Amino acid sequence: IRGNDVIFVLKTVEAFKCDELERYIDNNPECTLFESLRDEEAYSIVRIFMDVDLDACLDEIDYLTAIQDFIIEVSNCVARFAFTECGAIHENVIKSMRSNFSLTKSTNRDKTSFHIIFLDTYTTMDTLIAMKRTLLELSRSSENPLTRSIDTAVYRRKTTLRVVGTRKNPNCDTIHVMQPPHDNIEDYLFTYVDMNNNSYYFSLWEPGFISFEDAIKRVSKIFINSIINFNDLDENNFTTVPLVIDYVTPCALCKKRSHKHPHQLSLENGAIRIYKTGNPHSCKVKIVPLDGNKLFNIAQRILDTNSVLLTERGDHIVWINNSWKFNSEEPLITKLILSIRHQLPKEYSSELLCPRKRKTVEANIRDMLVDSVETDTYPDKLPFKNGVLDLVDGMFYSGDDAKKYTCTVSTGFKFDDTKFVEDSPEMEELMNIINDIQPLTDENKKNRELYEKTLSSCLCGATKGCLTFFFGETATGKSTTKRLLKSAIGDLFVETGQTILTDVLDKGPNPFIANMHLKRSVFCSELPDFACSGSKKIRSDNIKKLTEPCVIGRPCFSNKINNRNHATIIIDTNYKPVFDRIDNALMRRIAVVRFRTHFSQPSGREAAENNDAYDKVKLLDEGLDGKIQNNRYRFAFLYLLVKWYKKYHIPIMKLYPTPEEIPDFAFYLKIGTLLVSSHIPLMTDLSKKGYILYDNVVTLPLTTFQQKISKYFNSRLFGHDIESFINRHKKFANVSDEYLQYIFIEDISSP
Amino acid sequence: YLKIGTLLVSSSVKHIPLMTDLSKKGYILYDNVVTLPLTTFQQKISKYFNSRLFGHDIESFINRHKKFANVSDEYLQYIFIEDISSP
Ligand SMILES: [Zn+2]
Numbered sequence: 022i023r024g025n026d027v028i029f030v031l032k033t034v035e036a037f038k039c040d041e042l043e044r045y046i047d048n049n050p051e052c053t054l055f056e057s058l059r060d061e062e063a064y065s066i067v068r069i070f071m072d073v074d075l076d077a078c079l080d081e082i083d084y085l086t087a088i089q090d091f092i093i094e095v096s097n098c099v100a101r102f103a104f105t106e107c108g109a110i111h112e113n114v115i116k117s118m119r120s121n122f123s124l125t126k127s128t129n130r131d132k133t134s135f136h137i138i139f140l141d142t143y144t145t146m147d148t149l150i151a152m153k154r155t156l157l158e159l160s161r162s163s164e165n166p167l168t169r170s171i172d173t174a175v176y177r178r179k180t181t182l183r184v185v186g187t188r189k190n191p192n193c194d195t196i197h198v199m200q201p202p203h204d205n206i207e208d209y210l211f212t213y214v215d216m217n218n219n220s221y222y223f224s225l226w227e228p229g230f231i232s233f234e235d236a237i238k239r240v241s242k243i244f245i246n247s248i249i250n251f252n253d254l255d256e257n258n259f260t261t262v263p264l265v266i267d268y269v270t271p272c273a274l275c276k277k278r279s280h281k282h283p284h285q286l287s288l289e290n291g292a293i294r295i296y297k298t299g300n301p302h303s304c305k306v307k308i309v310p311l312d313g314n315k316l317f318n319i320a321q322r323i324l325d326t327n328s329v330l331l332t333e334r335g336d337h338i339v340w341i342n343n344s345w346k347f348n349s350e351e352p353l354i355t356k357l358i359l360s361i362r363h364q365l366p367k368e369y370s371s372e373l374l375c376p377r378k379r380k381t382v383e384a385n386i387r388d389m390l391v392d393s394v395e396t397d398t399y400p401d402k403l404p405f406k407n408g409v410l411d412l413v414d415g416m417f418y419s420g421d422d423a424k425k426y427t428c429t430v431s432t433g434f435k436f437d438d439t440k441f442v443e444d445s446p447e448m449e450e451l452m453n454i455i456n457d458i459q460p461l462t463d464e465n466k467k468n469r470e471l472y473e474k475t476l477s478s479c480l481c482g483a484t485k486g487c488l489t490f491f492f493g494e495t496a497t498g499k500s501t502t503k504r505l506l507k508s509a510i511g512d513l514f515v516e517t518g519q520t521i522l523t524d525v526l527d528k529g530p531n532p533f534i535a536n537m538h539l540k541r542s543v544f545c546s547e548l549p550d551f552a553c554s555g556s557k558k559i560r561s562d563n564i565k566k567l568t569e570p571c572v573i574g575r576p577c578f579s580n581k582i583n584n585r586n587h588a589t590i591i592i593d594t595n596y597k598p599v600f601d602r603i604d605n606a607l608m609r610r611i612a613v614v615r616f617r618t619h620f621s622q623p624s625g626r627e628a629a630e631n632n633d634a635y636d637k638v639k640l641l642d643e644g645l646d647g648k649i650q651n652n653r654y655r656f657a658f659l660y661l662l663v664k665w666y667k668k669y670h671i672p673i674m675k676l677y678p679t680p681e682e683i684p685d686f687a688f689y690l691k692i693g694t695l696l697v698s699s700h701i702p703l704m705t706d707l708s709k710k711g712y713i714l715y716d717n718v719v720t721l722p723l724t725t726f727q728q729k730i731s732k733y734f735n736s737r738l739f740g741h742d743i744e745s746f747i748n749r750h751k752k753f754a755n756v757s758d759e760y761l762q763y764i765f766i767e768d769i770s771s772p
Numbered sequence: 773y774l775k776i777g778t779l780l781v782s783s784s785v786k787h788i789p790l791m792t793d794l795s796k797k798g799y800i801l802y803d804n805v806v807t808l809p810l811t812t813f814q815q816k817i818s819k820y821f822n823s824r825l826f827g828h829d830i831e832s833f834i835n836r837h838k839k840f841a842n843v844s845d846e847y848l849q850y851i852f853i854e855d856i857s858s859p
Contacts, residue, residue, distance in 0.1 A: 553832040596836070631786035738844035 493616025534574025
């Protein structure tokens, strides 16, 4: 659509532009033109507009407060309707609606009418048609005289709206005068679509009220004083007889001792309006409802601010003090009900001070929350205690903006821009520490890049399909890297023991199984070396099961077993891992990060001078570990992590395994590179080489195979591995021995 | 475990000039480094400390932190303190 600059009008027809309409209006002040839609189907996208009419006069203060509350209520209700039905964003709609709006007026001083248009919000006419019932409920479920007077009509096909500055009728001289700051004729058109940057768009007496006597009693209680002309009002004289009151005490509505004329009660929109006659500003207007609870309307107003949603599992997440809290032990809805009373009208705030009413208006909220939402869906954002830091752009959001993202976890500490710097001595000290841990030589280049990549994945809410191994001799200070990462990433990071590396992953109630829920990094240290006999091999089942994007595990006294998996798993030790089970999936799901830095004191430095444990040796310092424990380089290291993530995270970043540094998998690699599955039309070459083919399957004797492979590989090194491989690929039968099928790649190449 | 390193020394990688001299005392000097036989290393370990109270710990420590100049052979890369120190 890209907006429309043509305004179609009806004289009781034309298609004029902004300048054309302005010139025509200036030429003819008395012309009556109604702005409508030239074609309903073509340009159904229009602005959001409302028309309000209340036949009474109000002063400046009352009008100001009433219009403020009217904007608040209408914007919240429309944003809630957009969120539930049109799939929009609540915060965006609220911001667009409250940012800028055009408000007209009426030249008549005996009544208050206007047409209000929200400039930046645009939606299809079908959406405004569907909003009919919701807006009618809002109109009939409020106390504000402006909100109660909303005309739900004008939401029909091919509707028309009276243009500003033109008389509605030739006989009626009253016209609507524009108000600051718009002052332009294009700012009061409900079809003038002007989509731009700061904008948003979305799309898909009746007896039945109450007994008369109770209404009369309510009116009398409002008047406080007794009615002089009592026992005279009935069904017929409801809006005819004046209400004469004795001025025993000053009027509750006006606070004055007396007035020139009595009051009068009228019926409108299922409510009773009490107003004085003669001078209009002598007494205010009193509104009396005729249906609905008072505790249900409060629940609706608290609900349609989108602050008490429920999760996809069944937990009600509330928004208190700029953070999405939630607890399943002491539910927080009553805290929210108490703390939100300031954003509610005067009559709705005194109710939320009795604890027996903040349980009624809370049962209502729980009964109105049907269907769920999804939490922590955007993985490129880091939730801090006072907001959300964006990673792709680096901009920080605080306050209601962070509400847009259902961040159910947090790092635990606030975000400070002063410490968040680039050129600081702490940054240089951290860079020196990292260089000491990771020398930047060309030999280390690839390993250092893998280090930076696997260390920067901690700022990702997505799931990763690899498990990097920190392999390095002692005194390499991997604990320093662990401490720096913990200080940078807050309480999201978790350190776990080897309990998951040996036992069954799910099995029974495992605390680390549930703790992997939404934690962004899991670290294991000092692995139980399986080189010595007795220690269990690294459970291949657990490693395979930890890679999936889901976690299945239920702790003691619980039933939930589904957890979202975001943690990057890192294992650090000085011993090569040993896994009893081996398959191609394992060979494609293991990465190794090598450490070649020795941090040793001078006393043993000579002992480390010729040591083969590390490719370099340098003096250590006991005064650094405490510094890392004191969150010294926290924000500089966080900046480094952000830079690494930016330089590494392409539109799709993946953890690539490195199956070359693991000594155990080298045997399988050598076997595969020298022997694979056995090619029918190559019998002559096999016969020349000595091998024979029988029953369409080339075979050799088991003793012959052992003799052939004796020289190719060291039998004493991996005799158990060779026996296990033979058992796995065993075939048996045939001739007078077992059957072994393979191709000697080294012999296959040689003719 | 604590006392094993007290009477043990790191591999003398940078002892190429002295590796040849140490080889004549019962080392193979393979891969430009002095390497003693696994049986010889076990005998030296049993001589260093009472073999009655020292059993599988020495073998486990050797398998953890020693090599036989190849993938696996009958040698040991564990450098004796009383031998590797002397050129
Ligand atoms: Zn009054």
